[PDB]
């Protein structure tokens, strides 16, 4: 019963067009609660969950401050990136950063994260020890030797093991029903006679939080990676998730196949069989 708080930022330069666009989102577990947008009118960090709204004007002022200043810092960290890579002013470029922190059941810090990615590929990341970097290529090794000389990992480690963890414990209480409900998956099977010697069983798992759910198929207890299609877990729109898994079965042998939904809102794992 460990938890997580994550924060995803994206700088996308638009040469010739405006200043670089900056989007940024915050999550506790799989529940976004804040966002900010450099193209937005308000120019404020905004709320996207009920339990964050109950936060003082003190909060929103300070959160708008740091996000607005990651805004500007990442705009220059894109200009630096060009000079590093000798790149044309013409090109749009993406700089994503991810920072966050995990707590366990108790509330003790478990792990910190802080890292970057230029144009889809890793750039630099803080390793688990919170005292060293992982420089993806050679440009990143410039930043590495520099963030090492400047004891920047020290500074991150004081947010990660401190401030971050606090906000996580807090968010986790202010919203202890959104974030600490485990809504179990709703199960049912469907059956589409395809050709006149085959059929399709689809195992549906709808309405669950959190997203982590396992769906395996079994022909006579043995698991089947074979004639199977398994769609990515996907959002429903309201914070519940849905996944489905389906198998092509020979016609007549519908009940040689069992479906195995394993979610954490389920006391025991669910076996499912056809049955009209």
């Amino acid at each position: 019963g460990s938890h997580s708080m994550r924060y995803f930022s994206t700088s996308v330069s638009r040469p010739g067009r405006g200043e670089p666009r900056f989007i940024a989102v915050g999550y506790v577990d799989d529940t976004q609660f804040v966002r900010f947008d450099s193209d937005a009118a308000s120019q404020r960090m905004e709320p996207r969950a009920p339990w964050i709204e109950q936060e003082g004007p003190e909060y929103w002022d300070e959160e708008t401050g740091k996000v607005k200043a990651h805004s500007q810092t990442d705009r220059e960290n894109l200009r630096i990136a060009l000079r590093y890579y000798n790149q044309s002013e013409a090109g749009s470029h993406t700089l994503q950063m991810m920072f966050g922190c995990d707590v366990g059941s108790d509330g003790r810090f478990l792990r910190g994260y802080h890292q970057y990615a230029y144009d889809g590929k890793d750039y630099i990341a803080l390793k688990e020890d919170l005292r060293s970097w992982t420089a993806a290529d050679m440009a990143a090794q410039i930043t590495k030797r520099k963030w090492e000389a400047a004891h920047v990992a020290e500074q991150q480690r004081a947010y990660l093991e401190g401030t971050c963890v606090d906000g996580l414990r807090r968010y986790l209480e202010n919203g202890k029903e959104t974030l600490q409900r485990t809504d179990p998956p709703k199960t049912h099977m469907t059956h589409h006679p395809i050709s006149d010697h085959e059929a399709t069983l689809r195992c549906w798992a709808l309405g669950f939080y959190p997203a982590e759910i396992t769906l395996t198929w079994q022909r006579d207890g043995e698991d089947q990676t074979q004639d199977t299609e398994l769609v990515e877990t996907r959002p429903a729109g309201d914070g519940t998730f849905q996944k489905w898994a389906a198998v092509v079965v020979p016609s007549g042998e519908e009940q040689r196949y069992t479906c195995h939904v394993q979610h954490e809102g389920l006391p025991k794992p669910l076996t499912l069989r056809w049955e009209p």
Partner: peptide
């Protein structure tokens, strides 16, 4: 809480 630090690559 958003990260305070803002270093440059």
């Amino acid at each position: 809480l958003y990260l305070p630090v803002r270093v440059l690559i």
